[PDB]
Design a binder for this molecule. Structure first.
Ligand SMILES: O=c1cc(-c2ccnc(NC3CCOCC3)n2)ccn1[C@H](CO)c1ccc(Cl)c(F)c1
Length: 346
């Protein structure tokens, strides 16, 4: 029943459990599915003591239950108690993946070819996300699940949002956007975490990481993060500085003049086509940044690009939840996971 410490209680359908990983409010195991006669992954999530944790759980369930794409992880089943009072944990059943891009980059240097097809799969998945008017907001190697060189799946839609390009600059300390190393400069400079451009920047960082087996911008904190970006891209132009909305223009104007390090000096063994696409993805100005359809049509991905085999969402996605108390989110999580319960009507 239990996996060395915490109880699982996923049976009688899910047996022969083995521990995978853990976090602040969750634990992941592999389990044998006695129905589909295959091994699956089960995410035990206990978020109900904290509002933000509830937001992330609900966010990922609503989005993954609506999405159906080869490069996006799905939700196969959800195990949860029959009453709200009894519900303390939520078990999310997903397809079992061998590993993730983070683990792979620790043991292997990827060939140009593999990188290429990994990049294509990420962008193929992203095209579906963006066509649904959705932003992942946390794209990074550990959120890129793998089985083979031909089987990649984007996971963890906890930070996902519907794209609202014309919305309030919220506040710097109000929301957690990307993982720092993959965080777009617009998020750090003028709190803009509701445009498609932020995801293309993350992908750019992932591409640079596949090319050298190390993160391109490993900042200690967000100012160090901007210093790292500036160290390669160079000191921003007057036009690029006009996009900075905040005090924010100050510390950048305080820094010495940094020249643009050429991509080929940073990555001498990389294909010039990959470095040309990397350049378009890692543009400091979000308005000048390459869009997902343009990245796919780039010459670097010409051997895989096929718009007739790249599915898009049937309709844009719609849900706000961030201002709701943890008790209402628990109620919404109960409603969303009701499909997987016995006796479910309508
Ligand atoms: O949502 C998911 C789904 C999976 C998942 C799904 C299917 N298969 C495999 N296989 C793994 C085999 C070993 O290598 C990594 C992939 N993983 C893995 C992680 N996550 C997120 C990432 O933020 C996560 C991480 C820790 C905790 Cl605690 C958690 F709740 C959620």
């Amino acid at each position: 029943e239990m996996v060395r410490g915490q109880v699982f209680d996923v049976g009688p359908r899910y047996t022969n459990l083995s521990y995978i990983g853990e976090g602040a409010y969750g634990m992941v195991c592999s389990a044998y599915d006695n129905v589909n006669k295959v091994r699956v992954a089960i995410k035990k999530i206990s978020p109900f003591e904290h509002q933000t944790y509830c937001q992330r759980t609900l966010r990922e369930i609503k989005i993954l239950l609506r999405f159906r794409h080869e490069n996006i992880i799905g939700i196969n089943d959800i195990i949860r108690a029959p009453t709200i009072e009894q519900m303390k944990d939520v078990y999310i059943v997903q397809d079992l993946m061998e590993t993730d891009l983070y683990k792979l980059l620790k043991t292997q240097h990827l060939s140009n070819d593999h990188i290429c097809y990994f990049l294509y799969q990420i962008l193929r998945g992203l095209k579906y996300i963006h066509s649904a008017n959705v932003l992942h907001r946390d794209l990074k190697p550990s959120n890129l699940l793998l089985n083979t060189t031909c089987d990649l799946k984007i996971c963890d839609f906890g930070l996902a949002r519907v794209a609202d390009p014309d919305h309030d600059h919220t506040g710097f300390l109000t929301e957690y956007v990307a993982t720092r190393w993959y965080r777009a400069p617009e998020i750090m400079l003028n709190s803009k975490g509701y445009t498609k451009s932020i995801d293309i920047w993350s992908v750019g960082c992932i591409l640079a990481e596949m090319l050298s087996n190390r993160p391109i911008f490993p900042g200690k904190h967000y100012l160090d993060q901007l210093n790292h970006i500036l160290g390669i891209l160079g000191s921003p132009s007057q036009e690029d500085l006009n996009c900075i909305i905040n005090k924010a223009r100050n510390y950048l104007l305080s820094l010495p003049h940094k020249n643009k390090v050429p991509w080929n000096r940073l990555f001498p063994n990389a294909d010039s086509k990959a470095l040309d696409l990397l350049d378009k993805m890692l543009t400091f100005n979000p308005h000048k940044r390459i869009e997902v359809e343009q990245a796919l049509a780039h010459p670097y991905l010409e051997q895989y690009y096929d718009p007739s085999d790249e599915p898009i969402a049937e309709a844009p996605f719609k849900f706000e939840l961030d201002d709701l108390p943890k008790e209402k989110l628990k109620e919404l999580i109960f409603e969303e996971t009701a499909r997987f319960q016995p006796g479910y009507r309508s």
